[PDB]
Amino acid sequence: SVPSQKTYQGSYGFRLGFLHSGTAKSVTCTYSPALNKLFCQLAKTCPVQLWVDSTPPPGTRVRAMAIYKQSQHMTEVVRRCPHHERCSDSDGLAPPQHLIRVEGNLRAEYLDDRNTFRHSVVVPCEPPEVGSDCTTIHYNYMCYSSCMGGMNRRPILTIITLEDSSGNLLGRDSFEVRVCACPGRDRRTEEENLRKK
Ligand SMILES: CCn1c2ccc(C[NH2+]C)cc2c2ccc(-c3ccco3)cc21
Ligand SMILES: [Zn+2]
Incomplete structure (x- = not known):
């Protein structure tokens, strides 16, 4: 099956936000x-x-999962390629097969779904630090979009779900991801292609 990607703010008005990092050749x-x-x-x-927009209950969690964007590939599990799953870059917590890691959160848990075999990483939802307006999660993507035997140039989406302590849905958002050598140039190229379209 294919996990839902429908945007859903839910009772708490959940949505993502992103920094404005620009498109310089050096941007990461x-x-x-x-x-x-x-x-x-x-x-x-x-x-x-x-x-x-409002405070969710203690025990709320935030899960990230990747799926292929194109309909002809959405049923295939997104995983690291045959090289990267074996390169011994373990952080001590993430399984080496998982594309998405959370950086610097000792409460991160990694799930291999017993029925769908899909991978995800989930952390407790936490309030913003004192003086901040939002909470930030630091993710890492552990293969290139181009990796042969893995994503193999197929675009992916990341689905972020806000969940209760049982795993029930409270909110959902999503975004496409390209993991590449020069994100600044590729963003500029794809935005210009969109404008020409
Ligand atoms: C989703 C992260 N986040 C926020 C993000 C933005 C704002 C608004 N600031 C102007 C408030 C919160 C917030 C309030 C409570 C909790 C919370 C309580 C228990 C667990 O998580 C989590 C929260
Ligand atoms: Zn790879």
Whole structure:
């Protein structure tokens, strides 16, 4: 089956936010609102903001999962390629097969779904630090979009779900991801292609 990607703010007004990092050749992570697409380098920090209009209950969690965007591939599990799953870059918590990691959160849990075999990473939802307006999760993507035997140039989406302590849905948002060597140039190219279209 295919997990839902429907945007759903839910009772708490849940949605994502992204920094404005620009498109310089040196940028390591940059988000395109026009494409709803994050462009990032391999294994580099991707800050994703969480916003709500009202306070959710203790025990609320935030899960991230990748799926293929194209209909002809959506049923295939997104995983790291045959090289990267074996390169011993473990952080001590993430299974080596998982594309998406959370950086710097010892409460992150990694799920291999016993029925769908899909991978996800989930953390407790936390209020913003004192003086901040939102909460940020730092994600890493551990293969290139181009990796042969893995994503193999197929576009993916990341689905972020706000969940209760049982795993029931409270909110959902999503964004496309390209993991690439030059996110700034690729964002500029894809935005210009969109404008020409
Ligand atoms: C989703 C992260 N986030 C926010 C993000 C933005 C804002 C608005 N600021 C102007 C408030 C919150 C917030 C309030 C409570 C909790 C919370 C309580 C228990 C667990 O999580 C989590 C929260
Ligand atoms: Zn790879």
